[PDB]
Amino acid sequence: NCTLSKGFTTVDIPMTIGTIVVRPTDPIGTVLQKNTFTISPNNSTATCNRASDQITAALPLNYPVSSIGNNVYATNIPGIGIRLYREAFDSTDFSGYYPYKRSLTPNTTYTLSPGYFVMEVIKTAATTGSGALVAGRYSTYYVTGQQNRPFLTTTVLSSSPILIASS
C-alpha cells in the first residue's frame, strides 16, 4: 500500500481550449487541435511498500474507446474523440496514452514530474457534431489506495467550455 507525504496536494490543470473548427474535408483521424499545458509540480511524494502497488493514469468520464482505437476516446460530441498524455519539456519521457497502469518499486519515493500535459481533439467519424465537451474531470493520476488524493488531475470547467464547431 502507498503512503503520501505530509501536506500532499493534488495538482489540477484546467483545460481551456478555444473553439475547434471541424471541416468536412478533415479526414477521419485528423488531429483537429493539440494543446499543451504546463505541469507544475509541488513537493508531493508517494512511497509504496508492495511490488503490486501501481500508479494509475485514468479517464474518469469513462467514455468508450472511439471507432479508430489508438487511445482516442469518445466524447459527448459524435465524431469527436480525445487523446491524453504527458511528456517532458524536451518532449521525451512520453507517459504513454491514458489510460494505463505502471508497477511501482517498493520503497522508492515518487514525485510528479514536470513537463507538458497534452490534449488532442481528434476526428473519429465522417460526420461530426457541434457543441461543448461535457465538463468535469477528464484525467486523474494516482497511486494505489490514494485515488481520493491524486498527483494530477485535468479538468474541463463549465465556465470555460471547449466548443466544437462543425461546418
Residue numbers in the entry: 1 to 167
Authors' own words:
We identified two virulence pili independently critical to A. baumannii catheter-associated urinary tract infections, the chaperone-usher pathway pili Abp1 and Abp2. Further, their respective tip-adhesive proteins, the adhesins Abp1D and Abp2D, make use of large, distally oriented binding pockets to adhere to glycoproteins like fibrinogen, a wound-healing protein important in CAUTI pathogenesis. We demonstrate that Abp1D and Abp2D RBDs are structurally similar, and each binds fibrinogen and other relevant host glycoproteins important in CAUTI and other infections. These proteins share a common binding mechanism, using a large, distally oriented, and flexible pocket that recognizes a complex glycan receptor.
When determining the Abp1DRBD structure, we solved two molecules of this protein in the crystal (asymmetric) unit. However, while most of the binding pocket was structurally conserved, one region of substantial variation was a 10 amino acid stretch (R86-S95) encompassing the anterior binding pocket loop. Compared to molecule A Abp1DRBD, molecule B’s anterior binding pocket loop was displaced up and into the pocket, moving the α-carbon of S91 by 7.9 Å in the >50 Å long structure. The rmsd value of the backbone of this region was 2.275 Å, indicating that it was substantially distorted from one Abp1DRBD molecule to another. The anterior loop’s flexibility is significant because this loop can change the shape of the binding pocket, which likely affects protein function. While these two residues are conserved in the Abp1DRBD, they are too far away from each other (>4 Å) (in the crystal structures) to form a salt bridge in both Abp1DRBD molecule A or Abp1DRBD molecule B and the loops are more closed than in the Abp2DRBD structure (especially in molecule B of the Abp1DRBD structure).
